[PDB]
């Protein structure tokens, strides 16, 4: 009953340095400060095209036409005006509320909020220390700036507008997304577009049939990326070199990662072998044990006015560690099994489709058909509880709200990929 975004943001609201503030991201020193919005503890929204996270993607110039793949979309003018940034911000917050309004989404977002990147940044083993790429600098009305930890940033997409993805800064010796530590996750995403798909499985899994009659609910797309962030914040992402070739054409050499198959769920996720599944859980059970060991041996903390015991307790809250009467942390195998199974098998695109009761591709091995412009911010177009399929209208049945022919006022096709 409390909203996830407890405040009404307008893009032009003046900064306060707490939940509206110009910010700089780490090691992007030459970037201009960008206006950002802390929509929930540990979660910031930056309504800007992402020219910052990757220095080799510092502008919105497209590749030469011959080098653009069929499923790509370029418009260097998108998200350049205050009005678009306002609409982007409110679209993102509305999607967060839609997700939070399901028990599945409330759960996922709770995992994300407590999945604080581990304080493993010192060369001294016994010293807890933040890793600076898990922070941003938050500029204050008095001109000072304050370093702030955060788990999640939603940013606008780079030159390819439809390349939605969940990325994070790496570390000299730590693979933070796969050693249990976690790291701050940046999700390139836009609520202003969505993708056409086909209700017929034959057509949806054919690369050239159909033109994308049905529109994906962007809440599912966001939840998809949030599921990656969940894996990565708990440092349990599957290595991206574990992939399987799409054996249906083939000489294209297309591959999908296990991380993607897991994230989608459903029948897809059973292609991962049961022997590998138990092995991954064992590996990460051991990485969680290592973190509890590191915490038990921690003697000091630097770079904060917060106490050492509090910071230790933060990570007891994250990994659900047990504590004995000596204050020592340990991993409870029952809670770890449930935590792990929840992060990997419960939080899936397919399960979000069941909770949202929307129409959706039935497999990750489908083919995009079109991109549409949308506008979910008006309540007459899209709601927290119903998405496009407004229950109080003729769009309530047969997923008529996602039907871009029946609900054609809510979709402008921008490009056919076929």
């Amino acid at each position: 009953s409390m909203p996830f975004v407890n405040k009404q943001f307008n893009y032009k609201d003046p900064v306060n340095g707490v939940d509206i503030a110009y910010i700089k991201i780490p090691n992007a020193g030459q970037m201009q400060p960008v206006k950002a919005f802390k929509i929930h503890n540990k979660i910031w929204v930056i309504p800007e095209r992402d020219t910052f996270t990757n220095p080799e993607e510092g502008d919105l110039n497209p590749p030469p036409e011959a080098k653009q793949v069929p499923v790509s979309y370029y418009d260097s003018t998108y998200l350049s005006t205050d009005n678009e940034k306002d609409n982007y911000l409110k679209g993102v917050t509305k999607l967060f509320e839609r997700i939070y309004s399901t028990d599945l989404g409330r759960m996922l977002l709770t995992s994300i909020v407590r999945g604080i990147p581990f304080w493993g940044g010192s060369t001294i083993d016994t010293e807890l220390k933040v890793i600076d790429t898990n922070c941003i600098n938050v500029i204050q009305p008095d001109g000072s700036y304050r370093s702030e930890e955060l788990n999640l940033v939603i940013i606008g997409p780079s030159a390819d507008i439809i390349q939605f993805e969940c990325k994070s800064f790496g570390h000299e010796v730590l693979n933070l997304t796969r050693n249990g530590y976690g790291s701050t996750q940046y999700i390139r995403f836009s609520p202003d577009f969505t993708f056409g798909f086909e209700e017929s499985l034959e057509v949806d899994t054919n690369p050239l049939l159909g033109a994308g009659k049905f529109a994906t609910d962007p809440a599912v797309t966001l939840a998809h990326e949030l599921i990656h962030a969940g894996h990565r914040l708990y440092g349990i992402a599957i290595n991206p070199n574990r992939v399987f070739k799409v054996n249906t054409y083939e000489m294209s050499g297309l591959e999908v990662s296990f991380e993607e198959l897991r994230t989608f769920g459903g029948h897809d996720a059973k292609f991962i072998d049961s022997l590998q599944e138990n092995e991954f859980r064992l590996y990460y059970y051991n990485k969680f044990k290592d973190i509890a060991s590191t915490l038990n041996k921690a003697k000091s903390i630097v770079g904060t006015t917060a106490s050492l015991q509090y910071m230790k307790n933060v990570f007891k809250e994250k990994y659900l560690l047990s504590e004995d009467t000596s204050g020592k942390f340990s991993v409870d195998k029952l809670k770890f099994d449930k935590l792990y199974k929840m992060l990997t098998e419960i939080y899936t695109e397919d399960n979000f489709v069941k909770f949202f009761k929307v129409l959706n591709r039935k497999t990750y091995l489908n083919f995009d058909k079109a991109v549409f412009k949308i506008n979910i911010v008006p309540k007459v177009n899209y709601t927290i509880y119903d998405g496009f399929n407004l229950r109080n209208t003729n769009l309530a049945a047969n997923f008529n709200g996602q039907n871009t022919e029946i609900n054609n006022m809510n979709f402008t096709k921008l490009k056919n990929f076929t």
Partner: nanobody
Amino acid sequence: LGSQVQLVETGGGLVQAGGSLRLSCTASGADFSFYAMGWYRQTPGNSRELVAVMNLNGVISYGDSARGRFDISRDGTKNIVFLQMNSLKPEDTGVYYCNGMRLYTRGSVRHPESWGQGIQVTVSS
């Protein structure tokens, strides 16, 4: 693991202004067909620029003075690509690199692009 794909390029050399050369590039070690292949160049005292690149849907992109002079072709879906450079001029002198780009979709694995070692083209005036 990506360094298993190699772009072996042949057909450079000396030529008088106004003549032609044919560059060629065959890839080895690929269990796949490149989506696009093409040619870049680097002239003395200048950075690397696109000459001509073509994808399997037939789209061709060119550097400033290539279209009409330089014809790019490819042996079907095989990773074999040619650059027929007609009406060469002295300022076309430089090193020409092969380029190969794999296909990707929104949900697929991504791969770095492939690049050849380069071969010298030098046209006398």
